Design a protein around this ligand. Structure first.
Ligand SMILES: Nc1ncnc2c1ncn2[C@@H]1O[C@H](C(=O)N2CCN(CC(=O)Nc3cccc4c3CNC4=O)CC2)[C@@H](O)[C@H]1O
Lengths: 249, 306
């Protein structure tokens, strides 16, 4: 009964969880997901760390983020299922509750559940991504007590984007052959600062004005990216992040 | 018109025409000391921007965003008149935006609660309504007679300027149609809403459920217990971030406003993260300034002239 995994992956499993194989060794083999830690000195960490800080959104001032540990993610089968034909391959942010990462790592990203939309989803039942690290980071629901969260970096086959200025629950019907919806925001990383990591575009910051205005009212502050098929997504990195908040009271 | 600008430059707000006309009315009651002209009869004193008009400001650090700003005065509320100091009753102009004229005159008793009650749409109406109410308790013939005489001048003066004396006017019933939520103080939030309902969304808790959450925080028996009790507020603050990203700026304004109104110092920090941000996104930069300075300096004694 003794574990065979690296301590940093060991620490991750303890975080998302709770024989001749240790239970920590046992749960990972049941994720069916490679998670290989990267070195704090590595090119991949220096580049990904810079992505995280330069895309902390100006309106998300109640905290800052420190990157504790970085992991490389290769989900088996996801590489083959991947729409390699499609253009606009970007490395994009996805944040979620701690309680969701076993589900996310075991089964890949799923579309918005076919259950209760409530009123509906902002752009219908798809998978959501952001280009501002802190826009995605706010979806981890970290708190002063639970101040560790995860960010997912994924290659996203955007293909041809259906660009939208305002919200639309029926956005998926309007695709008519294009491959994803992009909600245009006042602010986003601009291509002048883009960089490449292992064959995927990295929308590096700082954010700038995008020149987008809704002539019919409110213009969203930041982009959102939505794909409606899990085969347009391929996880590549998983960030272990500590959220550093301000004075509570 | 020339003495208009000395008042408004100091406060960084425009004041309505009834503010200045009422000074001339009170000047007429007492040319020597116009502000206390209603003090003996009604227990009211003109203050706030009227202190500048009274020349009381030339004695003097002097911050007019706090001057006669009572403990529960949201940035919309600019005190102009004080009454009973036992209930700490006072009146103020209420503006939904620093770029608009006041929408009506409100009253609060800061020693009693945080609720702002509409009290006419001009300073003439607000005092007349108070006078009518004060006469019901008075049993002394000379005070009754004095108030009866003054009432005729206000009514005639209001008639002469074309000012309504109703507690709720037409613009007030029209503004109430634009109110996207009342908040704990009942005076309402007005935010821009475009053709897709963008600008406001409701809180995940009823007002009663929010008040209940706050009580468990303030009555927590240790800091370890308070931190745990904060979890529903922290949860709600993450949703406000989502609303902000999608231009529903009014949600964080309502949450921040309700926490300020509850009045506990345990909420000064979170309200300081919500309200400046909310006012800035709405292009109400001055109200963001007021609320920072008030949260940094929110006192129960507040005439910066002592
Ligand atoms: N197998 C799966 N296992 C566990 N969780 C899964 C999963 N598939 C989807 N999810 C998780 O459930 C949730 C889900 O579908 N939802 C809830 C969120 N909602 C809106 C939405 O996604 N907004 C949105 C918009 C922009 C960026 C980001 C998000 C969320 N995270 C981000 O970085 C859409 C429907 C989602 O938060 C996701 O993380």
């Amino acid at each position: 009964p003794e574990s065979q995994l690296d301590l940093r992956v060991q620490e991750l499993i303890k975080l998302i969880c709770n024989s001749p194989e240790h239970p920590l060794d046992q749960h990972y083999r049941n994720l069916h997901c490679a998670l290989r830690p990267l070195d704090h000195e590595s090119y991949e960490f220096k580049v990904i760390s810079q992505y995280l800080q330069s895309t902390h959104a100006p309106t998300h001032s109640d905290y800052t983020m420190t990157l504790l540990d970085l992991f490389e993610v290769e989900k088996d089968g996801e590489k083959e299922a991947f729409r390699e034909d499609l253009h606009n391959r970007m490395l994009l942010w996805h944040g979620s509750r701690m309680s969701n990462w076993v589900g996310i790592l075991s089964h890949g990203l799923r579309i918005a559940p076919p259950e209760a939309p409530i009123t509906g989803y902002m752009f219908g039942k798809g998978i959501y991504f952001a280009d501002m690290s802190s826009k995605s980071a706010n979806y981890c629901f970290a708190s002063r007590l639970k101040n560790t969260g995860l960010l997912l970096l994924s290659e996203v086959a955007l293909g041809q984007c259906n660009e939208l200025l305002e919200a639309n629950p029926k956005a998926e019907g309007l695709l008519q052959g294009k491959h994803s919806t992009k909600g245009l925001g006042k602010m986003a990383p601009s291509s002048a600062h883009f960089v490449t990591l292992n064959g995927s575009t990295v929308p590096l910051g700082p954010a700038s004005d995008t020149g987008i205005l809704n002539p019919d009212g409110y213009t969203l502050n930041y982009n959102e990216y939505i794909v409606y098929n899990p085969n347009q997504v391929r996880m590549r990195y998983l960030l272990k992040v500590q959220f550093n908040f301000l004075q509570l009271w | 018109h020339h003495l208009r600008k000395e008042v408004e430059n100091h406060y960084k707000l425009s004041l309505p025409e009834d503010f200045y006309h009422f000074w001339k009315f009170c000047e007429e009651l007492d040319p020597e000391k116009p502000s206390d002209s209603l003090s003996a009869s009604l227990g009211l004193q003109l203050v706030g921007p009227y202190d500048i008009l009274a020349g009381k400001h030339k004695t003097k650090g002097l911050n007019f965003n706090l001057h006669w700003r009572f403990y529960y005065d949201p940035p919309e509320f600019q005190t102009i008149i004080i009454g009973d100091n036992k209930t700490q009753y006072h009146m103020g102009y209420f503006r939904d935006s620093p770029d608009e004229f006041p929408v009506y005159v409100g009253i609060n008793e800061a020693k009693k609660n945080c609720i702002i009650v509409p009290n006419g749409d001009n300073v003439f109406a607000a005092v007349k309504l108070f006078l009518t109410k004060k006469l019901k308790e008075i049993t002394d013939k000379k005070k009754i007679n004095l108030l009866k005489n003054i009432d005729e001048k206000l009514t005639e003066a209001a008639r002469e300027l074309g000012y309504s004396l109703e507690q709720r006017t037409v613009k007030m019933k029209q503004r109430d149609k634009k109110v996207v939520t009342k908040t704990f103080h009942g005076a309402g939030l007005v935010v821009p809403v475009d053709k897709n309902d963008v600008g406001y969304r409701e809180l995940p808790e009823t007002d009663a459920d929010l008040k209940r959450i706050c009580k468990t925080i303030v009555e927590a028996a240790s800091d370890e217990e308070r931190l745990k009790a904060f979890a529903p507020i922290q949860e709600m603050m993450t949703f406000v971030q989502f609303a902000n990203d999608e231009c529903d700026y009014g949600m964080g304004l309502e949450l921040g406003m309700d926490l300020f109104c509850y009045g506990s110092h345990y909420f000064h920090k979170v309200a300081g993260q919500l309200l400046p941000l909310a006012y800035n996104l709405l292009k109400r930069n001055l109200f963001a300034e007021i609320i920072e300075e008030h949260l940094a300096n929110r006192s129960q004694e507040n005439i910066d002239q002592l």
